[PDB]
Amino acid sequence: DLLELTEDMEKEISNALGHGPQDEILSSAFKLRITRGDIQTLKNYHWLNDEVINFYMNLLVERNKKQGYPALHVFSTFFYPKLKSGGYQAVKRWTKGVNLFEQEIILVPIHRKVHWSLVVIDLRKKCLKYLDSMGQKGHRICEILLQYLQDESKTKRNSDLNLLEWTHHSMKPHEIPQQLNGSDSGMFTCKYADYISRDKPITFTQHQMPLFRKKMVWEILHQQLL
Amino acid sequence: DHINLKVAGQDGSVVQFKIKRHTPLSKLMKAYCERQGLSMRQIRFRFDGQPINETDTPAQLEMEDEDTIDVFQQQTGGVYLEHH
């Protein structure tokens, strides 16, 4: 949920978004180097780019872990495309060293033509929902992923999946935001992720987006969620 | 030792490279970027899904002969055009 901002906070956020060397790097971790240019995609009315989203998804993983939440795994926003094009053999190494199935929640951010959306696969109840702040349906997407999960379980565990007990899902008509601006799709994908990784039911609305943006630039500068 | 690495573009393009296991990958990156004429700001290099930093070395990343590096385009979408 929301909070207020300290004057110091407000200025630090102000300066990151303010003018300056676009390629100046303001925060580094997860091998990502967030630059002024990147963080500027959180200015109101702007579309978030992939650096902002991948950085945030990683903070969720660190947060969850430090606060005792469910084991979280997040795929790069480049995983799904490379799986769309080259099939499983093209991303089989992207889980090198990790046992997907020992995790509880997996998050897959998806970049659609011009808007962001997200998929949550819940390995605790073989569930798979597609959350799209633009109202869209994730059919191919969800099926294309469960299959990946199938292939991963065979190549890596040498056991097959029971795709039968694996049931899709698509957010109900009344959960889709009225305003409908692609501009905010990255914020919905991040916040949906935040809540869903916590089991906290989605209570926020589009009115909280501009505040959520300022909060998120501070959270990235300090690599800590509020 | 020398090692060969392949850089796959999102357009099916592939470019081979040859470098020493202890050479910063920054050379490979500016190289590719020049040859295909792209903006660094606009692209991302990844080795098995994980970013590659300019100081990383094929040795550190534990790369091997004929290993593949992926290159993707920035994912944005819209553009805000503020007036006045």
From Swiss-Prot, chain A:
GO molecular function: deSUMOylase activity; SUMO-specific endopeptidase activity
CC terms in the record's Gene Ontology section: cytosol; nuclear membrane; nuclear pore; nucleoplasm; nucleus; PML body
Region (Protease): 33-197
Maturation and modification: Polyubiquitinated; which leads to proteasomal degradation.
Record's keyword terms, sorted: Cytoplasm, Hydrolase, Membrane, mRNA transport, Nuclear pore complex, Nucleus, Phosphoprotein, Protease, Protein transport, Thiol protease, Translocation, Transport, Ubl conjugation, Ubl conjugation pathway, Wnt signaling pathway
Keyword Endoplasmic reticulum: no
Catalytic site: 115, 132, 185 (nucleophile)
Gene Ontology biological process terms from the UniProt entry: fat cell differentiation; heart development; labyrinthine layer development; mRNA transport; negative regulation of protein ubiquitination; positive regulation of protein ubiquitination; positive regulation of transcription by RNA polymerase II; protein destabilization
Primary localisation category: nucleus
Domain of life: Eukaryota
Quaternary organization: Binds to SUMO2 and SUMO3. Interacts with the C-terminal domain of NUP153 via its N-terminus. Interacts with MTA1.
Known function: Protease that catalyzes two essential functions in the SUMO pathway. The first is the hydrolysis of an alpha-linked peptide bond at the C-terminal end of the small ubiquitin-like modifier (SUMO) propeptides, SUMO1, SUMO2 and SUMO3 leading to the mature form of the proteins. The second is the deconjugation of SUMO1, SUMO2 and SUMO3 from targeted proteins, by cleaving an epsilon-linked peptide bond between the C-terminal glycine of the mature SUMO and the lysine epsilon-amino group of the target protein. May down-regulate CTNNB1 levels and thereby modulate the Wnt pathway.
Comment block on domains: The N-terminus is necessary and sufficient for nuclear envelope targeting.
Family membership: Belongs to the peptidase C48 family.
Name of the featured protein: Sentrin-specific protease 2
Curated annotation (Swiss-Prot), chain B:
Cellular compartments annotated: Nucleus; Nucleus, PML body
Molecular function (Gene Ontology), one example: protein tag activity
Glycyl lysine isopeptide (Lys-Gly) (interchain with G-Cter in SUMO2) crosslink, residue number(s): 6
Principal location listed in the UniProt entry: nucleus
Ranges of residues in domain Ubiquitin-like: 1-80
Tissue specificity as recorded in UniProt: Broadly expressed.
PTM per Swiss-Prot/TrEMBL: Polymeric SUMO2 chains undergo 'Lys-6'-, 'Lys-11'-, 'Lys-48'- and 'Lys-63'-linked polyubiquitination by RNF4.
Propeptide residues according to the Swiss-Prot or TrEMBL record: 79-80
Any one cellular-component term (Gene Ontology): nucleus
Gene Ontology biological process: positive regulation of proteasomal ubiquitin-dependent protein catabolic process; positive regulation of transcription by RNA polymerase II; protein sumoylation
Crosslink feature (Glycyl lysine isopeptide (Gly-Lys) (interchain with K-? in acceptor proteins)) location: 78
Keywords annotated in UniProt: Acetylation, Host-virus interaction, Isopeptide bond, Nucleus, Ubl conjugation, Ubl conjugation pathway
Quaternary data: Interacts with SAE2 and UBE2I. Interacts with ZNF451. Identified in a complex with ZNF451 and UBE2I/UBC9, where one ZNF451 interacts with one UBE2I/UBC9 and two SUMO2 chains, one bound to the UBE2I/UBC9 active site and the other to another region of the same UBE2I/UBC9 molecule. Covalently attached to a number of proteins. Interacts with PELP1. Interacts with USP25; the interaction sumoylates USP25. Interacts with SIMC1, CASP8AP2, RNF111 and SOBP (via SIM domains). Interacts with MTA1. Interacts with HINT1. (Microbial infection) Interacts with Epstein-barr virus BGLF4.
Function text: Ubiquitin-like protein that can be covalently attached to proteins as a monomer or as a lysine-linked polymer. Covalent attachment via an isopeptide bond to its substrates requires prior activation by the E1 complex SAE1-SAE2 and linkage to the E2 enzyme UBE2I, and can be promoted by an E3 ligase such as PIAS1-4, RANBP2, CBX4 or ZNF451. This post-translational modification on lysine residues of proteins plays a crucial role in a number of cellular processes such as nuclear transport, DNA replication and repair, mitosis and signal transduction.
Family: Belongs to the ubiquitin family. SUMO subfamily.
Stated name of the protein: Small ubiquitin-related modifier 2
Protein source organism: Homo sapiens
Included stretch of the parent chain: 16 to 95 of 95
